[PDB]
């Protein structure tokens, strides 16, 4: 029930959705990067600290 222009527009709508999917994936991977940065820092820093404590 659609001409060429209308079905093209529906395709562009599905595309605005795909770009939205890309954006939400980008912000989610940025967030998990924040938490993984934090936990990497915590564990690595604490291990170095413990080695320095026993050397002390």
């Amino acid at each position: 029930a659609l001409s060429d222009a209308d079905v093209q527009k529906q395709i562009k709508h599905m595309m605005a959705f795909i770009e939205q999917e890309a954006n939400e994936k980008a912000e989610e991977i940025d967030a998990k990067a924040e938490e993984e940065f934090n936990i990497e820092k915590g564990r690595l820093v604490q291990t170095q600290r413990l080695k320095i404590m026993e050397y002390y």
Binding site: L2, H13, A16, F17, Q20
Partner: protein, 361 residues
């Protein structure tokens, strides 16, 4: 009354007036009630899974037709302050349910929208699930209580033959400190009462003389008792069963009366004292059930209006109430109105050229 939910592309900024009551596009020429619908603010989340989301949403909708119409059926069966045909004014948490429908406001406070649509839908699903579980358990308990009261009042009824003698027989009727006798309440009707008082000796040897004693009256016959040695009880029963006399070796027990009546009165009073809470709890929980009901309906309206017009969520919803027997005219004029949106085919049948849902009370 039966209402019609319609949603449109909502292109024009002033189209809301057309949705509400504009006389040019009003329904049945100002004879059908038309009102706007407060569109909830909702996310999108995803579209790939959204087909399944709408699917299981519809299945949940069917199941909750089940549960809430059973709630309606039970609150009608209570028949105290609410019945099938009287006292049917149903309140959506204080006001008339149509007043809440026409003043629909999304439940922003209870259910914030920062949460994804999926998780909100499962929240509502399990809320309805625990509502249903509470209904099942508590209504089954009340069914048990009602059955107990019915059995009590049933055992408190019946003739002398079909019920223990509560307010009829007493201690003096039966033999006291009996060494050899037993008092059998041999009921005799007046059709052959002279027969009994004359040949109770023929009915049995070694019988108490002048034992022709009559205790009370009933509509089928007259209660009377006979004091008899054991062999005399055997013989009297044997030759009185054929004489159309009811045989009964009842034992006097004031407890059999007092207990049953005490449980009857106490269970009835406690059942009412607990049925107060029943009606309060039931009407309340059904009002919030209907609130969440219209909320999930609005969520559906949003999902289908969105996927109808693609990604953008621009649409304008509105309640409606067509006149009976003017329905088809409204169908064809609205088809004329909305068939230019697509200009090709929107055999319109279920998927109307407008995003539609149906509700009826």
């Amino acid at each position: 009354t039966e209402f019609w939910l319609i949603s449109a592309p909502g292109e024009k900024t002033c189209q809301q007036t057309w949705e509400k009551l504009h006389a040019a596009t009003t329904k049945n020429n100002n004879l059908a009630v038309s009102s706007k619908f407060n569109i909830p603010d909702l996310k999108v989340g995803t579209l790939d899974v959204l087909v399944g989301l709408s699917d299981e949403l519809a299945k949940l909708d069917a199941f909750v037709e089940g549960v809430v119409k059973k709630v309606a059926q039970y609150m009608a069966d209570v028949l105290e302050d609410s019945k099938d045909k009287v006292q049917e004014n149903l309140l959506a948490s204080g006001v008339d349910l149509v007043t809440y429908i026409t003043r629909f406001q999304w439940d922003m406070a209870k259910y914030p929208i920062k949460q994804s649509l999926k998780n909100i839908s499962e929240i509502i699903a399990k809320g309805v699930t625990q509502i249903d579980n509470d209904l099942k358990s508590r209504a089954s308990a009340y069914n048990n209580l009602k059955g107990n009261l019915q059995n009590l009042e049933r055992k408190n009824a019946g003739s002398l033959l079909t019920r223990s003698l509560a307010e009829i027989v007493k201690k003096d009727d039966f033999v006291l400190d009996s060494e050899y006798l037993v008092t059998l309440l041999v009921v005799v009707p007046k059709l052959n009462h002279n027969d009994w008082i004359k040949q109770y000796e023929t009915l049995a040897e070694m019988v108490v003389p002048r034992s022709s004693n009559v205790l009370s009256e009933d509509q089928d016959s007259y209660l009377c008792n006979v004091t008899l040695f054991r062999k005399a009880v055997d013989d009297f029963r044997h030759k009185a069963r054929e004489n159309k006399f009811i045989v009964r070796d009842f034992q006097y027990n004031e407890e059999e009366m007092k207990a049953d009546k005490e449980e009857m009165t106490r269970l009835s009073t406690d059942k009412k004292k607990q049925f107060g809470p029943l009606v309060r709890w039931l009407k309340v929980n059904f009002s919030e059930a209907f609130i969440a009901w219209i909320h999930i309906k609005a969520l559906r309206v949003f999902v289908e209006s969105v996927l109808r017009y693609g990604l953008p969520v621009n649409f304008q919803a509105m309640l409606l109430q067509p006149n009976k027997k003017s329905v088809k005219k409204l169908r064809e004029v609205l088809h004329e109105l909305y068939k230019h949106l697509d200009s090709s085919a929107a055999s319109q049948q279920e998927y109307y050229p407008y995003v539609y849902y149906k509700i009826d009370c």
